[PDB]
Write a protein that binds this ligand. Structure first.
Ligand SMILES: CC(=O)N[C@H]1CNc2ccccc2C1
Length: 284
């Protein structure tokens, strides 16, 4: 029985290596990673892999690994797939912990934009969770944390992290992680998967996929939002992605909004992430 070596980048930046039978479905490798992580609330998470153009793709747990990675290396990342709108509802602290690690990467990467004060407040909870109570002995007036807090670090941000860290004395890691999530969950780009697209007139937009629905970012004055209930049907054809928007009460016909994606694969990817969010958040 021939087995392939899999390498998984974990959310703490460490590598997990295992073997699966070469005809294995994605669920087989995912179950192994989740057992390694002691993760029970697995529904929020998945494995990603990068293709030739270094684009992210979700490993479909129902399909053969080999038919997805195809010509590529069996190299994956462990990631949050469905960001819970209310992380307090999750049953386990260890679930909230992995969600925190994902969000820390969302912030440092700049996928999740954040004000100065929110960067410092999130960083202060991470430090409280990881080092415990503030200790002056470690930090002088010139202190810079090993922790990455932001896409661009400044001495002013490092100082503000410490000032807020002083206020969290006696906070346990679980408690600091819950405060982290209560702040992060309110950010306008929390849990938003962004896709480059063009509208029916060729104007560059972004489409955002999240728990609540689909967002169309046209300009800073113009953001269209379609709550999942308002979306009757999703489709792709060639490089195009279409959504069928319910008629208002007393209207005869649904409206259709079409978008141009860069290529056929980018249209299919957007379609599948929309279908998965629609199913998940319809049941949650
Ligand atoms: C205050 C607000 O606009 N809340 C939700 C409502 N609806 C909605 C629909 C699609 C994507 C995101 C959202 C955010």
């Amino acid at each position: 029985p021939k087995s392939m070596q899999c390498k998984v980048i974990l959310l703490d930046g460490s590598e997990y290596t295992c073997d699966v039978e070469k005809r294995s479905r994605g669920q087989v490798l995912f179950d192994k990673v989740c057992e390694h992580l002691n993760l029970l609330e697995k529904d929020y998470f998945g494995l990603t892999y990068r293709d030739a153009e270094n684009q992210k793709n979700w490993l479909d747990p129902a399909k053969e690994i080999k038919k997805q990675v195809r010509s590529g290396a069996w190299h994956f990342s462990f990631n949050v797939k469905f960001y819970p709108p209310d992380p307090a509802q999750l049953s386990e602290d260890i679930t909230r912990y992995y969600l925190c690690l994902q969000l820390r990467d969302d912030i440092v990467s700049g996928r999740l934009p954040c004000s100065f004060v929110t960067l410092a407040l999130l960083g202060s909870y991470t430090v409280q969770s990881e080092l415990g109570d503030y200790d002056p002995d470690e930090c002088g007036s010139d202190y810079i944390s090993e922790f990455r807090f932001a896409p661009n670090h400044t001495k002013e941000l490092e100082d503000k992290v410490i000032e807020l860290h002083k206020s969290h004395r006696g906070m346990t890691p679980a408690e600091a992680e819950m405060h982290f999530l209560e702040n992060a969950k309110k950010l306008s780009m929390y849990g938003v998967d962004l896709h480059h697209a063009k509208d029916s007139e060729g104007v560059e937009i972004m489409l955002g996929v999240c728990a609540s629905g689909l967002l169309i970012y046209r300009d800073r004055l113009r953001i269209n939002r379609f709550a999942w209930p308002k979306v009757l049907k999703i489709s792709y054809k060639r490089n195009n992605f279409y959504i069928k928007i319910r008629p208002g009460e007393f209207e005869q016909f649904e409206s259709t909004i079409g978008f141009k994606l860069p290529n056929h694969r980018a249209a299919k990817r957007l379609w599948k992430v929309c279908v998965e969010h629609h199913t998940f958040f319809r049941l949650l």
